[PDB]
Coordinates of C-alpha atoms in Angstrom, one line a residue:
Chain W
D1 CA 0.0 0.0 0.0
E2 CA 2.8 2.5 -0.9
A3 CA 0.3 3.9 -3.5
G4 CA -2.6 3.8 -1.0
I5 CA -0.8 5.7 1.7
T6 CA 1.1 8.3 -0.3
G7 CA -0.7 11.6 -0.7
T8 CA -2.7 14.2 1.2
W9 CA -4.9 13.3 4.1
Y10 CA -7.2 15.3 6.3
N11 CA -8.5 14.7 9.8
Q12 CA -11.7 15.7 11.7
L13 CA -10.0 18.9 13.0
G14 CA -9.2 20.1 9.4
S15 CA -5.4 19.3 9.8
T16 CA -3.5 18.3 6.7
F17 CA -1.1 15.3 6.6
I18 CA 1.1 15.2 3.4
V19 CA 3.0 11.9 3.3
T20 CA 5.2 9.8 1.0
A21 CA 5.4 6.1 1.7
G22 CA 8.9 4.6 0.6
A23 CA 9.2 1.0 -0.7
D24 CA 11.5 0.4 2.4
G25 CA 8.8 1.3 5.0
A26 CA 9.7 5.0 5.4
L27 CA 7.1 7.8 5.9
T28 CA 8.2 11.3 5.1
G29 CA 6.3 14.5 4.7
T30 CA 4.7 17.5 6.4
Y31 CA 1.9 18.1 8.9
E32 CA -0.2 21.3 9.4
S33 CA -2.3 21.4 12.5
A34 CA -5.6 23.3 12.4
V35 CA -5.4 23.6 16.2
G36 CA -3.0 24.3 19.0
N37 CA 0.3 26.2 19.2
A38 CA 1.1 25.6 15.5
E39 CA 1.4 27.5 12.3
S40 CA 2.2 26.3 8.8
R41 CA 4.0 23.0 8.0
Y42 CA 6.2 20.8 10.3
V43 CA 8.4 18.0 9.3
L44 CA 7.2 14.5 9.9
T45 CA 8.8 11.1 9.7
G46 CA 7.6 7.6 10.5
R47 CA 7.4 4.0 9.4
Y48 CA 4.7 1.6 8.0
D49 CA 4.4 -2.1 7.5
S50 CA 5.5 -2.5 3.8
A51 CA 4.3 -6.2 3.6
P52 CA 0.9 -6.2 5.4
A53 CA -1.3 -9.3 5.9
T54 CA -3.5 -10.3 3.0
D55 CA -6.5 -11.4 5.2
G56 CA -8.3 -8.0 5.0
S57 CA -6.4 -6.5 8.0
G58 CA -5.3 -2.9 8.1
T59 CA -1.6 -1.7 7.6
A60 CA 0.1 -0.6 10.8
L61 CA 2.0 2.7 10.7
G62 CA 3.1 5.6 12.8
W63 CA 4.7 9.0 12.6
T64 CA 6.1 11.8 14.7
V65 CA 6.0 15.6 14.5
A66 CA 8.2 17.8 16.7
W67 CA 6.3 21.2 16.9
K68 CA 9.3 23.4 15.9
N69 CA 9.5 25.1 12.6
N70 CA 10.8 28.5 11.4
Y71 CA 7.7 30.3 12.8
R72 CA 7.0 28.7 16.2
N73 CA 8.3 26.2 18.8
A74 CA 5.7 24.6 21.1
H75 CA 8.4 22.5 22.9
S76 CA 6.4 19.3 22.2
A77 CA 6.1 16.3 20.0
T78 CA 3.1 14.2 18.8
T79 CA 3.2 10.6 17.8
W80 CA 0.4 9.0 15.8
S81 CA 0.0 5.2 15.9
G82 CA -2.6 3.6 13.8
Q83 CA -3.6 1.6 10.8
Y84 CA -4.4 2.4 7.1
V85 CA -7.6 0.8 5.8
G86 CA -7.8 0.8 2.0
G87 CA -10.8 0.9 -0.4
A88 CA -13.5 3.4 -1.7
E89 CA -13.5 5.3 1.6
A90 CA -9.8 4.8 2.6
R91 CA -9.0 5.9 6.2
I92 CA -6.0 6.1 8.5
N93 CA -7.4 5.5 12.1
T94 CA -5.0 6.7 14.8
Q95 CA -4.4 7.3 18.4
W96 CA -1.8 9.9 19.4
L97 CA 0.4 11.0 22.3
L98 CA 1.4 14.7 22.6
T99 CA 4.3 15.2 25.0
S100 CA 5.6 18.6 26.2
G101 CA 9.0 19.3 27.7
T102 CA 8.3 19.9 31.3
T103 CA 10.0 20.4 34.6
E104 CA 10.2 17.3 36.8
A105 CA 7.5 18.8 39.1
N106 CA 5.0 19.0 36.1
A107 CA 6.1 15.7 34.3
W108 CA 3.0 13.9 35.6
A109 CA 1.0 16.3 33.3
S110 CA 3.3 16.2 30.3
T111 CA 1.3 14.0 27.9
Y112 CA -2.1 14.3 26.1
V113 CA -3.8 11.4 24.5
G114 CA -6.3 11.6 21.7
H115 CA -7.5 10.0 18.4
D116 CA -7.6 11.3 14.8
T117 CA -9.2 9.8 11.8
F118 CA -7.7 10.8 8.4
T119 CA -9.6 10.6 5.0
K120 CA -8.5 11.5 1.5
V121 CA -11.5 14.1 1.3
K122 CA -12.1 17.4 3.1
Chain M
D1 CA 20.9 18.2 23.2
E2 CA 22.1 16.6 19.9
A3 CA 25.1 15.3 21.9
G4 CA 22.9 14.3 24.9
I5 CA 20.4 12.2 22.9
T6 CA 22.7 10.6 20.4
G7 CA 23.9 7.1 21.5
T8 CA 22.8 3.8 22.9
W9 CA 19.9 3.7 25.4
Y10 CA 18.3 0.8 27.4
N11 CA 14.8 0.5 28.9
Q12 CA 13.5 -1.4 31.9
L13 CA 12.7 -4.5 29.7
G14 CA 16.3 -4.7 28.5
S15 CA 15.5 -3.4 25.0
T16 CA 18.2 -1.4 23.1
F17 CA 17.5 2.0 21.4
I18 CA 20.4 3.2 19.2
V19 CA 19.8 6.7 17.9
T20 CA 21.4 9.6 16.2
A21 CA 20.0 13.1 16.7
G22 CA 20.5 15.4 13.6
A23 CA 21.1 19.2 13.9
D24 CA 17.7 19.6 12.0
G25 CA 15.6 17.7 14.6
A26 CA 15.8 14.2 13.0
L27 CA 16.1 11.0 14.9
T28 CA 17.4 7.9 13.1
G29 CA 18.6 4.5 14.3
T30 CA 17.6 1.0 15.3
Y31 CA 15.6 -0.6 18.0
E32 CA 15.9 -4.1 19.4
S33 CA 13.0 -5.3 21.6
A34 CA 13.8 -7.8 24.5
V35 CA 10.0 -8.8 24.4
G36 CA 7.3 -9.6 22.0
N37 CA 7.2 -10.8 18.4
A38 CA 10.6 -9.3 17.6
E39 CA 14.1 -10.4 16.7
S40 CA 17.2 -8.4 16.1
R41 CA 17.1 -4.7 15.0
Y42 CA 14.4 -2.7 13.4
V43 CA 14.6 0.7 11.7
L44 CA 13.4 3.7 13.6
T45 CA 12.8 7.3 12.7
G46 CA 11.5 10.3 14.6
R47 CA 11.9 13.9 15.6
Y48 CA 13.0 15.9 18.6
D49 CA 12.8 19.6 19.7
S50 CA 16.3 20.9 18.5
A51 CA 15.8 24.2 20.4
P52 CA 14.4 23.3 23.8
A53 CA 13.4 25.7 26.6
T54 CA 16.3 26.8 28.9
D55 CA 14.2 26.9 32.2
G56 CA 15.2 23.2 33.2
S57 CA 12.3 21.6 31.1
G58 CA 12.9 18.3 29.3
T59 CA 13.3 18.0 25.5
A60 CA 10.3 16.7 23.7
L61 CA 10.8 13.8 21.2
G62 CA 9.2 10.8 19.5
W63 CA 9.9 7.9 17.3
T64 CA 8.3 5.1 15.4
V65 CA 9.3 1.4 14.8
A66 CA 7.3 -0.7 12.3
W67 CA 7.9 -4.3 13.4
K68 CA 9.1 -5.7 10.0
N69 CA 12.7 -6.6 9.3
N70 CA 14.4 -9.4 7.3
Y71 CA 13.6 -12.0 10.0
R72 CA 10.0 -11.3 11.1
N73 CA 6.9 -9.2 10.5
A74 CA 4.6 -8.6 13.5
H75 CA 2.2 -6.4 11.4
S76 CA 2.4 -3.7 14.0
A77 CA 4.0 -0.4 14.8
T78 CA 5.0 1.3 18.1
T79 CA 5.3 5.1 18.6
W80 CA 7.1 6.4 21.7
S81 CA 6.4 10.0 22.8
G82 CA 8.4 11.5 25.6
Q83 CA 11.0 13.8 26.8
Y84 CA 14.8 13.7 27.3
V85 CA 16.1 14.9 30.7
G86 CA 19.8 15.5 30.8
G87 CA 22.4 15.3 33.5
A88 CA 24.3 12.8 35.6
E89 CA 21.5 10.2 35.4
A90 CA 20.1 11.2 31.9
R91 CA 16.8 9.6 31.0
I92 CA 14.3 9.5 28.2
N93 CA 10.8 9.1 29.8
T94 CA 8.2 7.8 27.3
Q95 CA 4.7 6.6 26.8
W96 CA 4.0 4.4 23.8
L97 CA 1.2 3.2 21.6
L98 CA 1.5 -0.2 19.8
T99 CA -1.0 -0.6 16.9
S100 CA -1.6 -3.9 15.1
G101 CA -3.1 -4.2 11.7
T102 CA -6.6 -5.7 12.4
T103 CA -9.8 -6.5 10.7
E104 CA -12.6 -3.9 11.2
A105 CA -14.3 -6.4 13.7
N106 CA -11.1 -6.4 15.9
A107 CA -10.1 -2.7 15.5
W108 CA -11.4 -1.8 19.0
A109 CA -8.6 -4.0 20.4
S110 CA -5.9 -2.9 17.9
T111 CA -3.8 -0.7 20.3
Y112 CA -1.7 -1.3 23.4
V113 CA -0.5 1.5 25.6
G114 CA 2.5 1.5 28.0
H115 CA 5.5 3.4 29.3
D116 CA 9.2 2.9 29.0
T117 CA 12.1 4.7 30.7
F118 CA 15.4 4.7 28.9
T119 CA 18.8 5.2 30.6
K120 CA 22.4 5.2 29.2
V121 CA 23.3 2.3 31.6
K122 CA 22.2 -1.4 31.6
Chain Y
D1 CA -26.6 17.3 34.6
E2 CA -27.9 14.5 36.9
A3 CA -31.0 14.4 34.5
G4 CA -28.8 14.7 31.3
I5 CA -26.5 11.7 32.2
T6 CA -29.0 9.3 33.8
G7 CA -30.4 6.8 31.3
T8 CA -29.4 4.4 28.6
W9 CA -26.5 5.1 26.2
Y10 CA -25.2 3.3 23.2
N11 CA -21.7 3.4 21.6
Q12 CA -20.4 2.9 18.1
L13 CA -19.9 -0.8 18.7
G14 CA -23.5 -1.3 19.8
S15 CA -22.6 -1.7 23.5
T16 CA -25.2 -0.5 26.1
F17 CA -24.3 1.7 29.1
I18 CA -27.2 2.0 31.6
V19 CA -26.3 4.6 34.3
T20 CA -27.8 6.5 37.2
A21 CA -26.2 9.8 38.2
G22 CA -26.5 10.6 42.0
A23 CA -26.8 14.1 43.3
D24 CA -23.5 13.4 45.2
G25 CA -21.5 12.7 42.0
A26 CA -22.0 8.9 42.0
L27 CA -22.4 6.8 38.8
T28 CA -24.0 3.4 39.2
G29 CA -25.4 0.9 36.6
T30 CA -24.6 -1.8 34.1
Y31 CA -22.6 -2.3 31.0
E32 CA -23.2 -4.8 28.2
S33 CA -20.3 -5.0 25.6
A34 CA -21.2 -6.0 22.0
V35 CA -17.6 -7.2 21.6
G36 CA -14.9 -9.1 23.3
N37 CA -15.0 -11.8 26.0
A38 CA -18.3 -10.5 27.5
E39 CA -21.8 -11.7 27.9
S40 CA -24.8 -10.0 29.3
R41 CA -24.5 -7.2 31.9
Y42 CA -21.6 -6.2 34.2
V43 CA -21.7 -3.9 37.2
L44 CA -20.2 -0.5 36.8
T45 CA -19.5 2.4 39.1
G46 CA -17.9 5.8 38.7
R47 CA -18.0 9.5 39.4
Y48 CA -18.9 12.7 37.6
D49 CA -18.5 16.4 38.2
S50 CA -21.9 17.3 39.9
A51 CA -21.2 21.1 39.6
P52 CA -19.7 21.6 36.1
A53 CA -18.6 25.0 34.6
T54 CA -21.4 27.2 33.1
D55 CA -19.2 28.5 30.2
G56 CA -20.4 25.8 27.7
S57 CA -17.7 23.2 28.8
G58 CA -18.6 19.5 29.0
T59 CA -19.0 17.6 32.3
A60 CA -16.1 15.4 33.3
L61 CA -16.9 11.8 34.3
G62 CA -15.5 8.3 34.5
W63 CA -16.4 4.7 35.3
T64 CA -15.1 1.2 35.7
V65 CA -16.3 -2.3 34.7
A66 CA -14.5 -5.4 35.9
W67 CA -15.3 -8.1 33.3
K68 CA -16.6 -10.7 35.8
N69 CA -20.3 -11.6 36.2
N70 CA -22.2 -14.9 36.7
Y71 CA -21.5 -16.0 33.1
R72 CA -17.9 -15.2 32.4
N73 CA -14.7 -13.8 33.9
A74 CA -12.3 -12.1 31.4
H75 CA -9.8 -11.2 34.2
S76 CA -9.7 -7.6 33.0
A77 CA -11.2 -4.2 33.8
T78 CA -12.0 -1.2 31.6
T79 CA -12.0 2.4 32.7
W80 CA -13.7 5.1 30.6
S81 CA -12.7 8.7 31.1
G82 CA -14.5 11.4 29.3
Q83 CA -17.0 14.2 29.2
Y84 CA -20.8 14.6 28.8
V85 CA -21.9 17.2 26.3
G86 CA -25.6 18.1 26.6
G87 CA -28.2 19.3 24.1
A88 CA -30.2 18.0 21.1
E89 CA -27.5 15.4 20.1
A90 CA -26.2 14.7 23.7
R91 CA -22.9 12.7 23.7
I92 CA -20.5 11.2 26.2
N93 CA -17.1 11.3 24.5
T94 CA -14.6 8.9 26.1
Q95 CA -11.2 7.3 26.0
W96 CA -10.7 4.0 27.7
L97 CA -8.0 1.8 29.2
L98 CA -8.6 -2.0 29.3
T99 CA -6.1 -3.8 31.7
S100 CA -5.8 -7.6 31.9
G101 CA -4.3 -9.5 34.8
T102 CA -1.0 -10.8 33.5
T103 CA 2.2 -12.4 34.6
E104 CA 5.1 -10.0 35.2
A105 CA 6.7 -11.3 31.9
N106 CA 3.6 -10.2 29.9
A107 CA 2.8 -7.0 31.9
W108 CA 4.2 -4.7 29.1
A109 CA 1.3 -5.9 27.0
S110 CA -1.4 -5.7 29.7
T111 CA -3.3 -2.6 28.6
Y112 CA -5.4 -1.6 25.5
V113 CA -6.4 1.9 24.8
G114 CA -9.3 3.1 22.7
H115 CA -12.1 5.6 22.4
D116 CA -15.9 5.3 22.5
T117 CA -18.6 7.8 21.8
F118 CA -22.0 7.3 23.4
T119 CA -25.3 8.6 22.2
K120 CA -28.9 8.3 23.5
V121 CA -30.0 6.8 20.1
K122 CA -29.1 3.4 18.5
Chain V
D1 CA -7.3 -10.6 47.2
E2 CA -10.0 -8.6 49.1
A3 CA -7.5 -8.6 52.0
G4 CA -4.5 -7.8 49.7
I5 CA -6.1 -4.7 48.1
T6 CA -7.9 -3.2 51.1
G7 CA -5.9 -0.5 52.9
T8 CA -3.7 2.5 52.3
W9 CA -1.5 2.8 49.2
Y10 CA 1.0 5.4 48.1
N11 CA 2.2 6.3 44.6
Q12 CA 5.5 7.8 43.3
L13 CA 4.1 11.4 43.6
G14 CA 3.3 10.9 47.3
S15 CA -0.5 10.7 46.7
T16 CA -2.6 8.5 49.1
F17 CA -5.1 6.0 47.9
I18 CA -7.4 4.6 50.7
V19 CA -9.5 1.7 49.5
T20 CA -11.9 -1.0 50.7
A21 CA -12.3 -4.0 48.4
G22 CA -15.9 -5.6 48.8
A23 CA -16.5 -9.4 48.4
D24 CA -18.7 -8.4 45.4
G25 CA -15.9 -6.7 43.4
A26 CA -16.6 -3.1 44.7
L27 CA -13.9 -0.6 45.4
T28 CA -14.7 2.4 47.6
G29 CA -12.6 4.9 49.4
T30 CA -10.7 8.2 49.1
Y31 CA -7.9 9.7 47.1
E32 CA -5.6 12.6 48.0
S33 CA -3.4 13.9 45.2
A34 CA 0.0 15.4 46.1
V35 CA -0.1 17.3 42.8
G36 CA -2.4 19.3 40.6
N37 CA -5.6 21.3 41.4
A38 CA -6.5 19.2 44.4
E39 CA -6.8 19.6 48.2
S40 CA -7.6 17.0 50.8
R41 CA -9.6 13.8 50.0
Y42 CA -11.9 13.0 47.1
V43 CA -14.4 10.2 46.8
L44 CA -13.4 7.2 44.7
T45 CA -15.3 4.2 43.4
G46 CA -14.3 1.3 41.2
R47 CA -14.3 -2.4 40.5
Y48 CA -11.8 -5.3 40.7
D49 CA -11.8 -8.9 39.6
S50 CA -12.9 -10.8 42.8
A51 CA -12.0 -14.2 41.3
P52 CA -8.6 -13.7 39.6
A53 CA -6.6 -16.4 37.8
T54 CA -4.5 -18.8 40.0
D55 CA -1.5 -19.0 37.5
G56 CA 0.5 -16.1 39.1
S57 CA -1.3 -13.4 37.0
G58 CA -2.2 -10.0 38.6
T59 CA -5.7 -9.0 39.6
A60 CA -7.3 -6.4 37.2
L61 CA -9.0 -3.3 38.7
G62 CA -9.9 0.3 38.1
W63 CA -11.3 3.3 39.8
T64 CA -12.5 6.8 39.2
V65 CA -12.0 10.2 41.1
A66 CA -14.0 13.3 40.0
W67 CA -12.0 16.2 41.3
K68 CA -14.8 18.0 43.2
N69 CA -15.0 18.1 47.0
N70 CA -16.0 20.7 49.6
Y71 CA -12.8 22.7 48.9
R72 CA -12.2 22.7 45.2
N73 CA -13.6 21.7 41.8
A74 CA -11.1 21.1 39.1
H75 CA -13.9 20.1 36.5
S76 CA -12.0 16.9 35.7
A77 CA -12.0 13.2 36.4
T78 CA -9.2 10.6 36.5
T79 CA -9.6 6.9 35.9
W80 CA -6.9 4.4 36.9
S81 CA -6.8 1.0 35.1
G82 CA -4.3 -1.6 36.3
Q83 CA -3.5 -4.7 38.1
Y84 CA -2.7 -5.7 41.7
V85 CA 0.3 -7.9 42.2
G86 CA 0.5 -9.5 45.7
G87 CA 3.5 -10.6 47.8
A88 CA 6.3 -9.2 50.0
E89 CA 6.5 -6.0 47.8
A90 CA 2.8 -5.8 46.8
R91 CA 2.1 -3.2 44.0
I92 CA -0.8 -1.8 42.1
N93 CA 0.6 -0.9 38.6
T94 CA -1.7 1.6 36.8
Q95 CA -2.2 3.7 33.8
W96 CA -4.5 6.6 34.0
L97 CA -6.6 9.0 31.9
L98 CA -7.4 12.5 33.3
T99 CA -10.3 14.2 31.3
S100 CA -11.2 17.9 31.8
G101 CA -14.6 19.4 30.8
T102 CA -13.8 21.5 27.8
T103 CA -15.4 23.5 25.1
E104 CA -15.8 21.6 21.7
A105 CA -12.9 23.8 20.3
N106 CA -10.5 22.5 23.1
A107 CA -11.8 18.9 23.3
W108 CA -8.8 17.6 21.3
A109 CA -6.7 18.6 24.3
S110 CA -9.1 17.4 27.0
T111 CA -7.2 14.2 28.2
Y112 CA -3.9 13.5 29.9
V113 CA -2.4 10.1 30.1
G114 CA 0.1 8.8 32.6
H115 CA 1.1 5.9 34.9
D116 CA 1.2 5.5 38.7
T117 CA 2.7 2.7 40.7
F118 CA 1.2 2.2 44.2
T119 CA 3.0 0.5 47.1
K120 CA 2.0 -0.2 50.7
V121 CA 5.0 1.8 52.0
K122 CA 5.9 5.6 51.8

């Protein structure tokens, strides 16, 4: 599913995920968040299963954005872990962890958890 | 903290995380899990905050491993999201999400969550 | 929102959440999972914010089910943490953690994470 | 493990978890957080597996605190999901989800995730 994953994806917040899937399992591209302490595009990288099961299962994948670019630095990183599901209404269904750099006293509150669903439309 | 992060790290399970931190925010290297459906080294990639706060806060980072190599394919991916804390007993404190490729009927059970602490010793 | 929360709720899997909200912040009732190692109803208990903000924010709440009843014992417990949002299309938006009893060797894989959205219809 | 679980527990932050395990699977008691927007004791309730496996596995359990008492209201709830491990150095190993009541615009950032380990000492 190199073909299936590569391209522009959109989540329920209106964020834009632009990815290229490599034959080797690499994910590279850019992320633009519609929310939070974010402006414009941020580098992403990640990995995907380049030889998924042929029993109708999804394709496992994940990627990271560190929220620093030329405009802003939110001193934080998000990882998305999920699976690509192909077909007429292709989706990437994810859960994510957003960690901030914190002092040791605040480290208990360093990490948000959430879920994003990406589609090829909207 | 390019210097601080780059090198060999070990978690509480005895897994080995070998990383290079790029001046640009890139993380590249290899991961070897002491547990699960895993053998030998797997590619990782990720990102880190290359200009962290100077108020004693940690450095945010994350990375992904897709559990396919020349030996095995576990049809799964783990993302670690966390922060690097420098000093005499440097640590990377993480939480992680492990997603399997699943059928739609099993997708509710696709994702494990856990936490790993990495040190430069053991 | 004692009135708003009390009643029968349904999630996207077709599970049924039957709850009573107490004036004191208590949640009591029963849960029936449409999936997994589950049959019929299981006891639940939990808590909710009985004096929520009046600025349009949701109402925080959570509850637990241990997956033992007279029929089955899945040696596991799920906690849902979320917020109630009132109005024409009332919802309870949750994330959940499902922990199994494990041996120490398997404890890294003890916990699933997911998300459920409950509505008053279907 | 009604006997094993019932009593006073302490986590790595110095919080105090006071619980009674019922023969029926109920957990009742009080929680006092050493951190966050919290003062004094808060009601908790939860559930545990009252007939765990006899193969050396832990005992699954969970509980909820809504962060309202006579002193403060943090408009939030935490759920802990985990397992009790008996013996000389008994532990309750948990992961937790802390949800705030939010506006719909902030709901993506409503939930923290973390992990607490409880012991009978300190």
